[PDB]
Amino acid sequence: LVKNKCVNFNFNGLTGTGVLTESNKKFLPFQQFGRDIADTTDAVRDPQTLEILDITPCSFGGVSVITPGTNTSNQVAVLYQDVNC
């Protein structure tokens, strides 16, 4: 296992990608899947060590360009929408 990085993975035949972290919520001794409103799996029970892990997609981001017009000067500035510098 490896955590704290956006990785590609498959669990018992289901494929996915994102970052996996330890979970605090208590899982019933028979359930295996955690689902949200949009019907996307987020909680996985490991089949070897019997732990609960939570999957979160890594950073989305957004890029915008501020320009004063190429007719005058050829310089630009960059704006990131949700990136936390």
Ligand X SMILES: *[C@@H]1O[C@H](CO)[C@@H](O)[C@H](O)[C@H]1NC(C)=O
Interacting residue ranges for ligand X, rule: CB under 6 A: 48, 71-72, 84
Q: How far is the CB of 17 from another protein (least distance, A)?
A: 9
Largest CA distance in the chain: 68
Residue 48: name its binding partner from ligand X, another protein, none (Cβ under 5 to 8 Å by kind): ligand X
Question: Does residue 32 contact residue 45 with C-beta atoms inside 8 Å?
Answer: yes
Nearer to ligand X, 48 or 81 (CB): 48
Using the rule CB under 8 A, which residue among 6, 7, 14, 83 binds another protein?
14
Complete DSSP assignment for 1-53: ---SS-EEEEETTEEEEEEEEE--SPPPSS--EEE-TT--EEEEE-TTT--EE
* Residue 16 in contact with another protein, rule: CB under 8 A: yes
Residue ranges that bind another protein, judged by CB under 8 A: 13-16, 39-40
